[PDB]
Structures are given as structure tokens and as C-alpha cells.
Ligand binder design. Structure first.
Ligand SMILES: O=C(O)c1cc2ccc(Br)cc2[nH]1
Ligand SMILES: [Mg+2]
Ligand SMILES: [Mg+2]
Length: 715
């Protein structure tokens, strides 16, 4: 083979060369010290990595048996909780504490705002995200259904004046709500000027200043006829662009061209659930894009530079032009053949991600070429770590980060941790999980998909679960959402680390997003996930309407969730569903699996706008597979459906997916030759082997099937 021997490791050549030629130069790390470190860290930490994965299976086995000997209708919460405590699943709660995490950027410690997540393997998307720090509000309004496409206000080939007028009015209203005038409305502004460091807005009848002049943050152009005005509200900037000669500016009372909002304050470049990466080739593509972003030289479009402004009093200043980047590494489960050992055993992918994304991140802590340093001025590397189960697994990641920092020559705790709360064993020991990482943690967050998937698999043997749609409102998940916020606040996250909530998946349903996603900052989340720059701009509105810092101070000391509520298994009652309801749900789940799987297996796409069964565009990641396949495996497990019901739904849904994909030049149909489609067979396997996958994880099956596809495409 073409691997490179380094101690006990055999490294794929494409990876060894990438690291040597691209990642290493410019960091002042000795190439052979790095590699010796790779070998050493892998040899030392692999056994604990494996022991932790064994511990999961052991606990799950004991819970499986607990339910299997029960036959009793509801649940004795006291005994069940007693049981979890005996087996080491529920650990004791630690005494109160405060996180000590230092060297963290303002975007993370203090600023509340939208957070974007993007597949690192897609260079175009990755760049757009990093550039999404600042976005046009007019574009985000005119382009989506936030301004409804009613009669006369439709989007056509060219600019609708009627529709654009509603866009202007909406933004005017937002300005009045966010940066109020002393009297009058922005809707009647005629001009903007700066006199003696004060913003002066001209109305048809008279002039006026801001109610709170401290919200005036700066400007560009002449004070007496500015090209823009910079405002601030709740730590987030709002820039009014003034140009009477632009398409929209001509039609405007004050000549306003656009309202630019500081939107995606941070971005997560994702190596996990939003990308398909099953070998050395795929990892290198991802690693190379992550390198290009940190060096600032990635080009597909290029990265933006910082924005210059004139301070209210006349001095010059600069604001960041790029989203501050996190990287999401893969979790503890999977191995990857990018490196194998002497026996041919693949190496843990999580361990590899820490070494390589960490190495690569050093470039983002230093001046580019294309220019000042791209990323963390405070000297931190921000790694999101998904899918952990409990405190010992968080401590293991911390210890992994610790060992890498040495190999890298970095000061201890340079590598910060973003703790995802998306597994049940983490949820019910969340405080301990935060404590285990008290000097590294820079966020926690919640979601729906992975967390519900784990919820179902954990109580798989208990009985039939409620429908997927129903899960979103179950008592366990509402308590989980609140408990997460409470735990972070109690550990001093306010002003220190992010408290995040989940993704809006419905990329075309922006009106509903603006209307409903506001619940998240109102619940005290200092950040939440968005699927696009456009969504980031719209979700930014929510941080102007809601003072997250104030909400968090008011939540202080509260415990709004009990361990009982957290532990309330989402079992369906007797006689829950009519036959047609059962079919629709089965169709719904088979459709999401097939629609997502076909693009993953056949094209190596890990995220995209996938039409659901009712043709709504969703932008979900791989966890959609986990929840769906777990729900069907649960229904199949308990007699709700038959294997023939499952077969029929896949057959009924495959042509629909085929149809929703044409569409795509590279697409290969699944119907009517099902057992010839590796993707169709993957979908089938996920459901039918679902109950036997570790904690319901889909990567073992999905990765195998993707490799199979790649091998066939090469012969
Ligand atoms: O949890 C979700 O629904 C979700 C996560 C995620 C990451 C990247 C992209 Br693109 C879309 C996503 N959806
Ligand atoms: Mg997840
Ligand atoms: Mg239900």
C-alpha cells in the first residue's frame, strides 16, 4: 500500500503529504515531533476511547433488561431513578461552581447573536458563512416570504416597486423599535447628518436625535452628507447605507440604500453531521478547506476584510468583517481508515480531528498573507465536540485537547470546548459535564434530532414511542431545553460562554422563522443555529427585540426542570393512532431517510435543501437519519407496523424522492430496481438494523455503504 510508517501507525499518503506540505509550514512545529506526537497520543488515548465506548453498551444493555422484565403500565420514577443511580448512569450532582475559561473572544463571551453551521467540505458555502458576519436586510426581506407574496407584491424577473416599498417600511419599523428617535419615526426621515458627535435625523417638520445617543456608533463619508450611519443595540451593529442614486435609494425619502445587520457573529465549520467523509481523500478535502479559511487564502469568491468607520467624534476605527470560526470535530465513536495501525485497525477519527484541526487552527491565530490574522485575537481554538455521553467522556476530550496542545507547543487550555448536549446521559449529568470542562468550556447547546434519537434508543425496550412531530413538544424535551439554560447560567456562563439552541431547518419558511424562532433568546439562549446567511440576518432581528443579557440575569438561581421531567420517557398511550396516521408517519420517516441517504451515498453530500414528504425544503444534518430510523425501529420492535409496512413505504417513497431530485444532473434513480441501489439498500439497512446500532448511530452503516458506492463507481 501507499501508507507512511510512523511508529505503530500507517498513514494514508494523501494525508501525510497534505500535512507536510500544507498544514505544517508556517507553524514552527518540527515535522517529526508532530508525527511522533500523533503516534504517541493515539497509542496512549485509544484504550480509554474504547473503554468509554464499551461503557455505553454496558449501560444500555442493563437498561434494555430493566425494561424487559417490567410488564408494568406507567413507570415507577423513584425505582427507575434508583436504578440509573446504581448502574452509574445518573451521577451525583456537584457543588455549585463557576467556570474559569479564559482567553475567549468577545463574540463568544458577551455578544448574543445568530450562529451559522456549514459543511466544511463545501468551499463555496464555507466562504459565504465566514462572510455572513454582515448581511443585507433588504435582500433578506425582499428575497423571502417574510414580506408575503400577496397580490401585487410578488417577486418576478425584475424589481417589484410595490414589494420593495413594503421592504423599506418593515426596516423603518425595525429601526424605530431598535434604535428609537427622541420624537418621530425613521419612516419620515429625510436625511442623516453628524454634528458635534451627535447623530441628527432630519424630519419634514423638524430635526431630532436618538432617544439613546449612545446607540450612535459611527459613520462613513462626510459628517454633513454621510455615505452610511452605524448604530448599535444589544451589542449588535446596524448600518444604514445612504445612496440616493441606487435602485432602491432613488425611491427612498432619505435616500437609504439598505440596512446592513451584523448577523452571523460566529460560524461552525463542520466536520461531522453535515459532511460525508468516509476516507483519507474526504478528510483531506475538509482539512484543506479548514486550512484555507484559517490562512485566509481559501478561494472558490474570497474572504472579506474588516470594515472601516469614523467614530462619532471623528476618530477612525475598525469592526471585524468575518464570522469568528468554530470547528466541529467528529465525536468519540468512529474510526477512519485515514490512518490504520500495524494490525490494519483504523484509528479513532475524533482523536485525529483534534490533532489535525488543532494544527490547522494555528494558522488562524497568525497573520494571513491575504492581512491581519483571520480568527481568534485572544489566542483560542474553538472546537465543538458532539455526541458525548456523560462527564467522563467530557473529561476524556479535555485530556485529548491537553495532549494535543503539548504536541502543538500550545499553552494549556488553548483548545476550548463547545459541549453539545444531545445525548441523554449528558443531559441528566449536565452540571458535572460542565464541571469536567470548567477551564475549557465556551458553549453548551441543545437540539432536536440527535437528542431525540438517543432518547428513543435508550428507552427502545420500554414500548412504542410517540410520533416524530409529537416529540418536539414532549415533557422530556421541554425540560431538557430549560435545564440546559439553567445549568449554564448557574455555572456562570452569562458574560463568559455561549448558551445555544437549535437549528431552524425550514429554509424557505422565513416568515415563520421570524415569527417563532424568537422563543430562543426569550428562553435566555445567547445564540442559536441558522442554516444560511439569509436566515442569520433575519434571526438577528430577534436579538434586537430581546435583551438576552437581561433575560439571563432574571433567570439566575431558577431551577425550572426536575430530574423527573428530564427522565419522562416519551411512550405513546394506548390507542394513540388511527391506521392512516400510522401510515403517514411511516411514509414521513421513510421519505426523510431516503431523501437524505440518496444524496449522502451517491454524491457525498451531507447537507442540502431536501424536500420533505409535503415538499417543504428542510436543511437537516445526518441526525435526521438517527431519529427517523430509531422511530421506525421502535415501531417495528413493538408491533405498531410490519416489515411489509416498512417495505411498502420505502417502495412508495423511493419514486417520489426520485422525482424530487430531477432536479439533479448527477442523480441516479432508485425505483424501480431497488436492490440495485446501494442508497436504497442503505436506507433499508438503517431501519432494519436500527435497534442494533450503538446508541442508534447511523455512521457505521452509512459510512460502509458510501465506501461501497465509491468502490463500484471506480470499476
Ligand atoms: O440540527 C439540525 O437540524 C441541523 C444541524 C446542521 C448543521 C449544518 C447544516 Br448546513 C444544517 C444543519 N441542521
Ligand atoms: Mg447532532
Ligand atoms: Mg404521537
Amino acid at each position: 500500500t501507499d501508507r507512511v510508517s510512523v511508529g505503530n501507525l500507517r498513514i494514508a499518503r494523501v494525508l501525510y503529504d497534505f500535512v507536510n506540505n500544507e498544514a505544517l509550514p508556517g507553524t514552527d512545529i518540527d515535522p517529526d515531533s508532530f508525527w511522533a506526537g500523533v503516534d504517541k497520543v493515539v497509542a496512549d488515548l485509544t484504550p480509554q476511547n474504547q473503554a468509554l465506548l464499551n461503557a455505553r453498551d454496558e449501560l444500555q444493555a442493563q437498561i434494555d433488561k430493566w425494561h424487559r422484565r417490567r410488564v408494568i403500565e406507567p413507570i415507577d420514577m423513584d425505582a427507575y431513578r434508583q436504578f440509573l443511580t446504581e448502574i452509574g448512569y445518573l451521577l451525583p450532582e456537584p457543588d455549585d461552581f463557576t467556570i474559569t475559561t479564559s482567553g475567549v473572544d468577545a463574540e463568544i463571551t458577551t455578544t448574543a447573536g445568530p450562529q451559522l453551521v456549514v459543511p466544511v467540505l463545501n468551499a463555496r458555502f464555507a466562504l459565504n458563512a465566514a462572510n455572513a458576519r454582515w448581511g443585507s436586510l433588504y435582500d433578506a426581506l425582499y428575497g423571502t416570504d417574510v414580506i408575503p407574496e400577496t397580490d401585487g407584491a410578488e417577486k418576478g424577473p425584475t424589481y417589484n416597486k410595490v414589494r420593495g416599498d413594503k421592504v423599506i417600511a418593515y426596516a423603518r419599523k425595525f429601526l424605530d423599535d431598535s434604535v428609537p428617535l427622541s420624537s418621530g419615526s425613521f419612516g419620515d426621515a429625510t436625511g442623516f447628518t453628524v454634528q458635534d458627535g451627535q447623530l441628527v435625523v432630519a424630519l419634514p417638520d423638524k430635526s431630532t436625535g436618538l432617544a439613546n445617543p449612545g446607540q450612535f456608533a459611527g459613520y462613513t463619508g462626510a459628517a454633513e452628507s454621510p455615505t452610511s450611519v452605524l448604530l448599535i443595540n444589544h451589542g449588535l451593529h446596524i448600518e444604514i447605507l445612504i445612496d440616493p442614486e441606487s435602485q432602491v435609494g432613488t425611491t427612498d425619502r432619505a435616500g437609504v440604500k439598505d440596512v446592513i445587520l451584523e448577523s452571523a457573529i460566529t460560524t461552525i465549520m463542520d466536520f461531522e453531521d453535515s459532511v460525508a467523509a468516509v476516507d483519507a481523500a474526504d478528510k483531506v478535502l475538509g482539512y484543506r478547506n479548514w486550512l484555507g479559511l484559517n490562512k485566509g487564502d481559501l478561494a472558490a469568491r474570497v474572504l472579506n476584510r474588516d470594515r472601516n468607520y469614523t467614530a462619532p467624534g471623528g476618530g477612525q476605527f475598525t469592526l471585524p468583517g468575518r464570522s469568528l470560526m468554530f470547528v466541529r470535530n467528529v465525536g468519540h465513536l468512529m474510526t477512519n481508515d485515514a490512518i490504520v495501525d500495524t494490525d490494519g485497525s483504523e484509528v479513532f477519527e475524533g482523536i485525529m480531528d483534534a490533532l489535525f484541526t488543532g494544527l490547522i487552527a494555528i494558522h488562524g491565530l497568525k497573520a494571513s498573507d491575504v492581512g491581519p490574522l483571520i480568527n481568534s485575537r485572544t489566542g483560542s481554538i474553538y472546537i465543538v465536540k458532539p455526541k458525548m455521553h456523560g462527564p467522563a467522556e467530557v473529561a476524556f476530550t479535555c485530556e485529548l485537547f491537553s495532549r494535543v496542545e503539548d504536541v502543538l507547543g500550545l499553552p494549556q487550555n488553548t483548545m476550548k470546548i463547545g459541549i453539545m448536549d444531545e445525548e441523554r446521559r449528558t443531559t441528566v449529568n449536565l452540571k458535572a459535564c460542565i464541571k469536567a470542562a470548567a477551564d475549557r468550556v465556551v458553549f453548551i447547546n441543545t437540539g432536536f434530532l440527535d437528542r431525540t434519537g438517543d432518547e428513543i434508543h435508550t428507552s427502545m425496550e420500554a414500548g412504542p414511542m410517540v410520533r416524530k412531530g409529537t416529540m418536539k413538544s414532549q415533557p422530556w424535551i421541554l425540560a431538557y431545553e430549560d435545564h440546559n439554560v439553567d445549568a449554564g447560567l448557574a455555572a456562570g456562563f452569562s458574560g463568559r460562554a455561549q448558551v445555544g439552541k437549535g437549528m431552524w431547518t425550514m429554509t424557505e419558511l422565513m416568515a415563520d422563522m421570524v415569527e417563532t424562532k424568537i422563543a430562543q433568546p426569550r428562553a435566555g439562549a445567547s445564540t442559536a443555529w441558522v442554516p444560511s446567511p439569509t436566515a442569520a440576518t433575519l434571526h438577528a432581528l430577534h436579538y434586537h427585540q430581546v435583551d438576552v443579557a437581561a433575560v439571563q440575569q432574571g433567570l439566575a438561581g431558577k431551577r425550572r426542570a426536575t430530574i423527573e421531567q428530564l427522565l419522562t420517557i416519551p411512550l405513546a398511550k394506548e390507542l394513540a393512532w388511527a391506521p392512516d396516521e400510522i401510515r403517514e408517519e411511516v411514509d414521513n420517516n421513510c421519505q426523510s431517510i431516503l431523501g437524505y441517504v440518496v444524496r449522502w451515498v451517491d454524491q457525498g453530500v451531507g447537507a442540502s435543501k431536501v424536500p420533505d414528504i409535503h415538499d417543504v425544503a428542510l436543511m437537516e444534518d445526518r441526525a435526521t437519519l438517527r431519529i427517523s430510523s430509531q422511530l421506525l425501529a421502535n415501531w417495528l420492535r413493538h408491533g405498531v407496523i410490519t416489515s411489509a409496512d416498512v417495505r411498502a413505504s420505502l417502495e412508495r417513497m423511493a419514486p417520489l424522492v426520485d422525482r424530487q431530485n430531477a432536479g439533479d444532473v448527477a442523480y441516479r434513480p432508485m425505483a424501480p430496481n431497488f436492490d440495485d441501489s446501494i442508497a436504497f439498500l442503505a436506507a433499508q439497512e438503517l431501519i432494519l438494523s436500527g435497534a442494533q446500532q450503538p446508541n442508534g448511530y447511523t455512521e457505521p452503516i452509512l459510512h460502509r455503504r458510501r465506501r461501497e458506492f465509491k468502490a463500484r463507481a471506480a470499476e
